[PDB]
Amino acid sequence: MGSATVNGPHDGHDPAAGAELKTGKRILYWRDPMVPGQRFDKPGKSPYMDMPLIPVYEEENADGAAVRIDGRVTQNLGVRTAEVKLGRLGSTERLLVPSEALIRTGARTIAMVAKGEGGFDPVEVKAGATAGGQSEILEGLKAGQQVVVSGQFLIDSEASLRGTVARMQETTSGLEVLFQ
Numbered sequence: 001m002g003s004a005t006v007n008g009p010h011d012g013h014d015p016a017a018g019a020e021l022k023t024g025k026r027i028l029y030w031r032d033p034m035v036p037g038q039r040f041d042k043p044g045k046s047p048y049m050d051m052p053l054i055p056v057y058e059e060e061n062a063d064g065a066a067v068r069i070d071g072r073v074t075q076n077l078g079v080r081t082a083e084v085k086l087g088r089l090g091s092t093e094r095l096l097v098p099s100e101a102l103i104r105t106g107a108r109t110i111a112m113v114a115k116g117e118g119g120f121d122p123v124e125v126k127a128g129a130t131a132g133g134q135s136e137i138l139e140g141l142k143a144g145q146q147v148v149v150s151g152q153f154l155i156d157s158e159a160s161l162r163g164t165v166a167r168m169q170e171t172t173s174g175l176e177v178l179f180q
């Protein structure tokens, strides 16, 4: 048949999230072909009939069977994010995020955090540096949380690989011993 994913991201692509199966054709929910226009919270048997619901486009994988997210898609489609994580060593450890991720106002910063529950929430954060096309979250948020950045990356697989096939604390690499 072919792979109908020949196109990639468009302009305005902040390289924080390429969305690998968080959009496009990944299980969003279940529907009965006799109940189109509905929105079931999750798979199961139809309440209107007694048949197992039919899955959308991809049909029964998406989160790799709980490997990924808890089968919830915290992806508002037109809104991408970037996860909080420390991006320096030796330098002064700060939470690195895309410069457009945070809200600058007055003499402080706000972050609309991507909460794991599939929602977005505003947080007052300390943010005042810029480094390498990114900004520094001095204080405010924690690693493992995300912020809204509305940009796309080329291949999101690298990022996706964290948390699915890869686990471990700090999730770092090429850092066995650090003395000198």
Ligand SMILES: [Ag+]
Residues within 6 Å of the ligand: 032, 033, 034, 035, 046, 049, 051
């Ligand atoms: Ag039916």
